[PDB]
């Protein structure tokens, strides 16, 4: 049942959400980043200064060598093999999955994140070294009776060390206790990343009035493995302009808007009401319909009372990252090629919202 998967996610603000997994026999316990923005099960498999433990293939009786390497510059590299994998607070199953045993890496692992690997939940098209390497979830679905869908409730922190965050990854279904109101769905435009289409953007109800192709230039994706809302240059600039104006009563250093520095108010004085809400309208399942997800400053200002601006520029399209997902229960409905959003169960004047339908075309940035 899904209840045993509730709160199966932990993390530190800004360092991703991880789920406990085991690999090999006997089970080796590891914390693994839940990442909808990639498609490899890649796990630290050799000593590293940021790793307090790692996957030891030699300790595993069930390890099988694929005698093939993988090199991922962007870096990390490893050796492909398969082994038995389980998620202790997930489905009660064990699957033989591809594992990229990371033997060397540079600026991949995060100091103090408390995770030792990544669970790439996106599609084979973007698996490394190529689409022949079946992703974990594909293996899980093919080998078990787990429904071809998962959902994420990322809860963030809320009110010396980075704030601890929590959440739930529900594998194989939708846990109604994790959300309120209606689930609205936007199509997965193509199965590689979880690519979606944004058709309109508003800041405090004010339309940015851009050609919608701009919102999806050159793609828009939903990525738990990204902290911020990342926006294409033109959209980021229009958004920041609008947010600045909305919060004009209080002026901040441009270093804050650039996501560099933190703004501080002493405990409990943060003027949330000065910052605007942001509404992303996503293409509906029905051609000329859309719906909006509305996020509060409590989502896009992330605690480090000090905060960093969690909206940042992208040259690879829109990325609806953790701070966006944190307002919502997000359903990755792979079976029906669609992604659902609803208000998550996790101030007194505003609330994150999911609302539709709203009236409209050709917003996709073809490829
Ligand atoms: C197959 O190779 C992969 C796999 C995953 C990733 C990353 C990744 C890698 C390491 C750490 C994080 C990370 C850091 C902080 C917060 N939250 C995720 C993300 N996951 C995504 N979504 N992103 C955009 C990435 O950079 C990168 C590469 C190159």
Swiss-Prot record:
From which residue to which does any coiled coil extend?
none
Activity modulation:
Inhibited by RTN3 and RTN4.
Query: Where is this chain primarily localised?
Result: membrane
Catalytic activity reads: Broad endopeptidase specificity. Cleaves Glu-Val-Asn-Leu-|-Asp-Ala-Glu-Phe in the Swedish variant of Alzheimer's amyloid precursor protein
Q: How does it sit in the membrane?
A: Single-pass type I membrane protein
Q: Which residues form the active site?
A: 35, 223
GO CC, sorted alphabetically, is:
axon; cell surface; dendrite; early endosome; endoplasmic reticulum lumen; endosome; endosome membrane; Golgi apparatus
**Which ranges does the record list as Extracellular topological domains?**
1-367
Q: List-wise, which residues carry N6-acetyllysine?
A: 68, 209, 213, 219, 233-234, 241
Q: What induces it?
A: Up-regulated by the Ca(2+)-regulated transcription factor NFATC4.
The GO biological-process annotations, alphabetized, read as: amyloid fibril formation; amyloid precursor protein catabolic process; amyloid-beta formation; amyloid-beta metabolic process; cellular response to amyloid-beta; cellular response to copper ion; cellular response to manganese ion; detection of mechanical stimulus involved in sensory perception of pain
Q: Sites of glycosylation?
A: 92, 111, 288
Task: Give every Peptidase A1 domain span.
Answer: 17-342
Which family does the entry's similarity section mention? Belongs to the peptidase A1 family.
> Could you identify this protein by its name?
Beta-secretase 1
Q: Which species is listed as the source?
A: Homo sapiens
What lineage is on file? Eukaryota, Metazoa, Chordata, Craniata, Vertebrata
Identify the coding gene: BACE1
């Amino acid at each position: 049942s899904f209840v045993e998967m509730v709160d199966n996610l932990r993390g530190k603000s800004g360092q991703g959400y991880y789920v406990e997994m085991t690999v090999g026999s006997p089970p080796q316990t590891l914390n693994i980043l839940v990442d909808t923005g990639s498609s490899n099960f890649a796990v630290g498999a050799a000593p590293h200064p940021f790793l307090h433990r790692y996957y030891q293939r030699q300790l595993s009786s069930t390890y099988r060598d694929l005698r093939k390497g993988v090199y991922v510059p962007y870096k990390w590299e490893g050796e492909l093999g398969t082994d038995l994998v389980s998620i202790p607070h997930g489905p009660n199953v064990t699957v033989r999955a591809n594992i990229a045993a990371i033997t060397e890496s540079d600026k991949f692992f995060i100091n103090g994140s408390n995770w030792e690997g990544i669970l790439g939940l996106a599609y084979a098209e973007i698996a490394r070294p190529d689409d022949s390497l079946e992703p974990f979830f594909d293996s899980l679905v093919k080998q078990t009776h787990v429904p071809n869908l998962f959902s994420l409730q990322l809860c963030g922190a809320g009110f010396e060390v980075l704030a601890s965050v929590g959440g739930s990854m529900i594998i194989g279904g939708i846990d109604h206790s994790l959300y309120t109101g209606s689930l609205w769905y936007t199509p997965i435009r193509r199965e590689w990343y979880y690519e979606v289409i944004i058709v309109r953007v508003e800041i405090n109800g004010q339309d940015l009035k851009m050609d919608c192709k701009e919102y999806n230039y050159d793609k828009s994706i939903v990525d738990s493995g990204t902290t911020n809302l990342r926006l294409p240059k033109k959209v980021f600039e229009a958004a920041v302009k609008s947010i600045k104006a909305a919060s004009s009563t209080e002026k901040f250093p441009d270093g804050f808007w650039l996501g560099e520095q933190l703004v501080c108010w002493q405990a409990g004085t943060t003027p949330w009401n000065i910052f605007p809400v942001i509404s992303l309208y996503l293409m509906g399942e029905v051609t000329n319909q859309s719906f909006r997800i509305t996020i509060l400053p409590q989502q896009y200002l992330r605690p480090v009372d000090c905060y960093k601006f969690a909206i940042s520029q992208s040259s690879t399209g829109t990325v609806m990252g953790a701070v966006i997902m944190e307002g919502f229960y997000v359903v990755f409905d792979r079976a029906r090629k669609r992604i659902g959003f609803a208000v998550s169960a996790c101030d007194e004047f505003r609330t994150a919202a999911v609302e539709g339908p709203f009236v409209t075309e050709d917003c996709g940035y073809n490829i």
